[PDB]
Design a protein around this nucleic acid. Sequence first.
RNA 1: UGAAAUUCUUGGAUUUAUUGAAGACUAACUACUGCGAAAGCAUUUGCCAAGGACGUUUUCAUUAAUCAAGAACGAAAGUUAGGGGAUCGAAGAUGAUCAGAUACCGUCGUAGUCUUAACCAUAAACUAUGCCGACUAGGGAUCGGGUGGUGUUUUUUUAAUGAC
RNA 2: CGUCGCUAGUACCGGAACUAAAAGUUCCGUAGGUGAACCUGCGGAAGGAUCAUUAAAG
RNA 3: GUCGACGUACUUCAUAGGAUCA
Lengths: 56, 211, 21, 127, 182, 283, 8, 96
Amino acid sequence: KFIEHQLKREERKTIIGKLQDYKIDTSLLTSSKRLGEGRQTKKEEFKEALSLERQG
Amino acid sequence: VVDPFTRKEWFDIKAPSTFENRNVGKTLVNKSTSASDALKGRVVEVCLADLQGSEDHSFRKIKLRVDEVQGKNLLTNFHGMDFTTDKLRSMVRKWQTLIEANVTVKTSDDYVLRIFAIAFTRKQANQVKRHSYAQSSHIRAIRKVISEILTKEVQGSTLAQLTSKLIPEVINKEIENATKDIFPLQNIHVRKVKLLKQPKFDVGALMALHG
Amino acid sequence: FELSDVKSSKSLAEIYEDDYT
Amino acid sequence: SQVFGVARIYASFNDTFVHVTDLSGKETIARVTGGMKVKADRDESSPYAAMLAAQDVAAKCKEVGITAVHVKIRATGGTRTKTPGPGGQAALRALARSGLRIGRIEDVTPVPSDSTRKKGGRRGRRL
Amino acid sequence: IKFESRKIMVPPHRMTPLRNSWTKIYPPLVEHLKLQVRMNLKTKSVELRTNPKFTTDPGALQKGADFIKAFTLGFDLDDSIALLRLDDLYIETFEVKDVKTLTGDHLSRAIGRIAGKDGKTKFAIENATRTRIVLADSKIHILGGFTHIRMARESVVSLILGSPPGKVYGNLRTVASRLKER
Amino acid sequence: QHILKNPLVAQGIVDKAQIRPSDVVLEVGPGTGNLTVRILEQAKNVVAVEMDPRMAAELTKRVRGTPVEKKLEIMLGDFMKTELPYFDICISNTPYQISSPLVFKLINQPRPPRVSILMFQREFALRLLARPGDSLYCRLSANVQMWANVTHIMKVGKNNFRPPPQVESSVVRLEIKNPRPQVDYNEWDGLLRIVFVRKNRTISAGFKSTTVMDILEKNYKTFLAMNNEMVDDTKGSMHDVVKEKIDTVLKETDLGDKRAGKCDQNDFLRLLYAFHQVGIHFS
Amino acid sequence: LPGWGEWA
Amino acid sequence: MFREERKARRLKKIKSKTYRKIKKKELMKNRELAAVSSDEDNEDHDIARAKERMTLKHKTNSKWAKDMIKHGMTNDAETREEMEEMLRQGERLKAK
RNA sequence: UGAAAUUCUUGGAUUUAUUGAAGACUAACUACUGCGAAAGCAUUUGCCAAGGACGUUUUCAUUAAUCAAGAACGAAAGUUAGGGGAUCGAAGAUGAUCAGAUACCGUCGUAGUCUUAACCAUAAACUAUGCCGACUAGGGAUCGGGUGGUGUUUUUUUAAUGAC
RNA sequence: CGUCGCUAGUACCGGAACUAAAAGUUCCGUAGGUGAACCUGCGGAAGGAUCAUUAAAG
RNA sequence: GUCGACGUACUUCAUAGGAUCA
Ligand SMILES: [Mg+2]
Ligand SMILES: [Mg+2]
Ligand SMILES: [Mg+2]
Ligand SMILES: [Mg+2]
Ligand SMILES: [Mg+2]
């Protein structure tokens, strides 16, 4: 168990390093929390339009 | 800024000559800038008691569609039939079998329509059983007889003749006479009439119908 | 306060009149 | 000399509608609801709302020319209750008192032969 | 006061009680409301018409119609007479099925739970809420004032959903106390 | 409210806290203060967060007239709403209604405690303690195991509490990992949320949902915008492109046919890296 | 019974 | 007859211990209040006492009582009452 | 809603009426009455085969009862791959977080609910009650069949049937 | 009756001015759960308190 | 590690009822 644990830790370290290699912000990205909604109000649509306009 | 009823105009509906009372009230519409397009396709539902002047028909309603307009007279045609909900709820009771039949058939005028008939078993004069359920075989036989009778009556007649049969409830008498031997029955009625398809319009057939 | 569990002798006309008066 | 209308009454749990239209039903003469006649949402379903609503529609109908109405009361129906509530009854009483002639009273609640599942769920609703 | 008519169809199971009580039904209708009364045996429905010469109260005809309808639903006569006497009494109706889909023995027990042993649980609700309840199989009718009936409906619904009678009875005492306060 | 009265379990809790004499202790849910006195006895100083003013006052009276006065500090408010001071160890018997937020807040403290002893409902505790392949493995398990390590200290039964609750309880130790692993919280949480809708189905079937396609396509549009590359913004423009991207990543990672409940940390991390490689960002 | 079957 | 049939049917299904227990007590009260049951002459008591002594059917050597007792089942109140209710009934028959 | 607030709405909501489209479900009649080994089973009509009971002065002559092994089916939920996706709806998000009879309420709603080809084989799958055989009380109601009457109704020509 | 306060506001160069300020139900099977002292979906059970009316083809 | 499940072994809580008398 110890040896598999250590091998898993090394794999984790390599993967996490490669993750830092490629990273971005998440403010503009839509969260997966919306998966249940399936329909948006006019307020939410206006917020999306404003955000997209700010992006350009 | 405009009261709509200033621009509205009144029109008087008229019924088929098959009914005794042709006067069935009035309606209204925006004045032509046309009014006729709004009038055509309009339907009005009215109890048979008003048209025939007898309370015996109080539980029956006729839907009539506006098909033509002439000089503030709205010439209509038969569009459908139904019973009142209260009457239907009255007929349905515990301790009896409800037999219902439906038939799709076209008249001699190519009026495709659907007739729904309902009936209930009854206990005889000397009955002492609480209930009067009928075996499934009797139900099926009665349903076949009813379907055959309805198809024969509709096919061998025109739509005006069909309504002329509906008003005096002759079809119910024929049904009960035919189904009498199979099983005694009560409350035999043509529950509903639907108009599925309409042939090509013929204003001549409407004028002749309206005299 | 104890609530009666038997049919009320007074009729609804009577109860509502007592409420009125 | 007696022109007829149809008084459509829709009695829901949280409000009452009084809707008067021509015999065909296509053209509405006057629509009033308990919301417009009351300050708080709670009393919209109250009968007091209904009688105010009924009286106003009756007043409008006399002005137009309508003198008689056929009453077609109804409830929400569908998968919900099938009987009109007190709001509908109070409006109907007001119409009679209003002086309009009541031709015929009929129930046209939407009654399903067999319907979809209700909102409540297995454990029920309306605690 | 114009010439008008009303018709109320009595179901078969209630008309014999109508026969049982009709001696006490036509007097109040004809003397107080000045209403001209009749029932058609052929159709088995009570026919009420306003007599223009003698009738005076415009709401009399509708008041009588609801009075018979109250009797038709199963309410006792004197309970229905309150409708004629007063003007602010209405009838609330609903099925158990809207509250909850109960079938078979579940349905039977729910009806029993509402009525209670010897009808005590129903007798509990009627007095506390100042209303009357008719348990017509799965059909419930409540008669009373608008605010009054809503408390009655809540307690009945609680029993249907499964609330044991005892906790319902305790709540009835609480609201009953508040009724006396106001 | 429910109050513990078995002294032995509380003594075990304070003992297993292993509070060094130079430690400041954040004691949530003071209650009467049975734990608090002993925490004060073996601590530099104690900060207490109480919601009920009366219980805080009673604690003040209880402690009043002892050596341990200057040590105790009582904050009045709602624990989440308050912004807390630095604290070294957290010992709580707070109402279970706040169990899940509490945990994450300790994780997201600017300087997280090295150790905390938390009392949680048995079902909740097991879910916190679940390992990959277990029945109760869930989003909470994976997330908390990313940001910390949780172990079981005791099982506390119904009889100890008065009035009895309808569920048993347990006490666990939470260890926030220092340094914090360098993975964005949002991206991890989004991937897990998409993959844990039904933890016993294929991950592919988890992604087959239409709303997931909409969210991922919008995310891809936003990312392409960030890199200054133009995008049409039509609703279904790259449904067919993102679909192929997802298919390829799922196939090559070989996680397409593996149930989420049986996936460990490294499997999810590999999936995250692949989705990033092909250009999809979840949150 | 006055008016059982006739107007009363 | 149909109405009684339906009512009798519904009561048959209800087999709740408490519900039957309430019903039995009320029935006994009415019968005692109405004195429906004829008095037992000295002969009826003597024969009844004879049979009870003859069999000893109302002591804890019966199967059900022994099974409940030997397995710590009678520590509970409700079963103890039932065991009691059996015993006092035997004692009543033993009275002279 | 206990009152509000997210929500829709002068681009016309809610409501009215004339239609059209999609997917479920078979109210009232409905009854522990009926059928099936059980789970279960309810609109009309056709086809395919299957079954109990009844009637038999028909036929084979012990071919039978129970059943470790082994086999078919097995509510609801659930898994794999297509289809469908109306209602309801685990999960998730979000409005409100004021008041104890109404104290868990609302909106959006993923999977599911439906169906096709296979898996899973669990329920208070209850009469908390193995299967076959015999015997041991009276009473009237019902479901299916059969026997009998110089019984009623009907066939409104008789009748014979049907229903009583 | 005076001084500086404290709360709100107005301006001026931490400071220095002005105004206002009536308060003291019990479960079973399965599937889930991140404001979980427990909730929720589907199917099932009573091991859960039956009052009234009821031939109206009378 | 004061870990989970199971196996094993023990502890523990549920006993008073009728009659007479004061
Ligand atoms: Mg049947
Ligand atoms: Mg699928
Ligand atoms: Mg199998
Ligand atoms: Mg079953
Ligand atoms: Mg046997």
